[PDB]
Every structure is written in structure tokens, then in C-alpha cells.
Amino acid sequence: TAFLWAQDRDGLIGKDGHLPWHLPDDLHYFRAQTVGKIMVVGRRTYESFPKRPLPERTNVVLTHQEDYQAQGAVVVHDVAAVFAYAKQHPDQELVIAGGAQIFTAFKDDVDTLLVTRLAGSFEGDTKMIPLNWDDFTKVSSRTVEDTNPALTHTYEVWQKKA
Template sequence: MIAYVWAQASNGTIGRDGTLPWHLPDDLQFFKQKTLGQLTLMGRTTYDGLRKRPLPNRTNVVLTRRLDYTAPGAVVVHSKAEALALAAAHPEQDLMIVGGAQVFTLFADVVDTLYVTRLAGEVSGDVVMPPLDWDAFERVSARLVPNDDPALAHTFETWQRRN
């Protein structure tokens, strides 16, 4: 399986200054649940936003064009083909793509599952989720989570690619 895991505000924001522009503990738990034990692919900027510390108990995979880039505790790949070959070599693990926007765009034609947390409100940021062909997917689950701050109410959604 190749899946995206991300959270976005109603205006499409997914990041600000290299990090998430909100703090939702249950979303972090959802992310952890989906990615533990899996190949967790992210772009260099997303990895740098983690303060260059790999996420524990996952195979962290960093995609970058920089040939001299090193990421201690992570596997570095330099192309989509290299990332897909790594996933094929580890069929016991799913490939969970966690951002950023350029990486989501790159894998849009091969992703088959979407795990999205949709925030009710708009949030300012400098990175937005690239457009997806939502007609190619079917929503298979949704769970609304209220919040004291209505803008931070959110829905966990799972989408599967239509056959």
C-alpha cells in the first residue's frame, strides 16, 4: 500500500515555517498509529522540520535532490523510482508519504490510500496541500472530533482509490 498521511486546514494549509501550524494531540496519535512500523517517506524540508531527528519505530525515508545530504537514522533516496524500489524491497511495510507538498505532488499517480485530518477552520501558513483528483477516490470512513476552538474541530477521513 502507498498512502498519504496529512492534516490540512479548510484553506488547504499544511505547514508554516517548516512545522505544523496547530497542535492537536489526537491528530498526532492518529499519525503515529498509521505510520508506526512502516516506511515513512518525507521530503528534506519536512525532515528538517523534525529537527533532523528520525521518527521513532519507523523506517524514515528522506527524499532529496541534494546528493550530499545525510540524515542520520534515516534512509536517503534521490528519486521517486528509488523510493518505490525501496518500498518494493520491503513488502512487509507500507509506504506512508507524510509530506511535504512537492512529495505529495510527485506520488499522486501511485497513491492508493489517503488518511487526511481536515480542520474546520482556516489557518495561515506557507505550504498548502497540492490539488488531488478526489474523483479517483472514495471516502470509506470519517470521524468528527469536536474541539473547544471551533476552528480546530477536525475530521479523520480515509479514502481509497477507486478501481
């Protein structure tokens, strides 16, 4: 399992799940990472996503209640089922596109964490769930500078150690 998300300096993800900040660069990064790999998106994500489903990619819509249904992404209401699905396709890695509730559910059993940090700050009604940084040790990171400081962002990857 892999964690793919973007956050500001303060620690907020956005509003209603949708990224309030328009960073075509960071957005490009998310899209590129989900190419040729299995990704899981929460129900809130299904509505927050810009356009689904993606081509040449495997998208999955995960919700707490089985009443909910999603188009373009496989709908799974079983936490165990999501793990098994990734297990079935060892060739393709599983990445959690969100949301935070989804992240929390699989946060404990994640080996790779991807985080995007923005120098600028944004305000919204949705904040990212707490993470244990000390438990995970950063393996590598990349820094990209945009025209505007707020726009400028960096990519950091953490791997769980035991």
C-alpha cells in the same frame, strides 16, 4: 503507498512545512499511523519534524538533490528507488509524510489517501498541492470533536479506483 497529511478547511498545510496549528490530538494520529510502518519524508520535512528518528519505525528522507543528506531516515534521491524500497518490504506499508513536493511526485501512484480536516482556519506561506478528489472515492472516515471548534478535526480516507 499511503498519503498522510493534515489540512485546514481553506486548504493550507502550514508554513515552511511545519504545522502552525497545535493539535496534540491530530499530531498523535500521525505518530500512531507511522508506527510499525515505512514512512517517507521530504527534506523540508526533515527540518519541520519535531524529533527524529522515531523508535521501532522505518523513516526515509527523500530529496531532489543527492547533495542533501539526512540523519535517522534513509536518504533516497531516486523516485523509482522509493517505490522499490516499499516493494521490498511488502509486510510494511509505505506512507508519505510529506512534503507536498514529495506528495506530488508519488501522488499519481497512491492507492490510499489520509486527510485530516480542521473546522478552524490557519494562515501560512505553504499550501497543499491540488488533489483529484473525483478520481478517488472515500472508503471510510472518523470524526473527533475537541473543546474548541478550531481544534476539532476529522479523519477521512480515500482509496484510488480504476
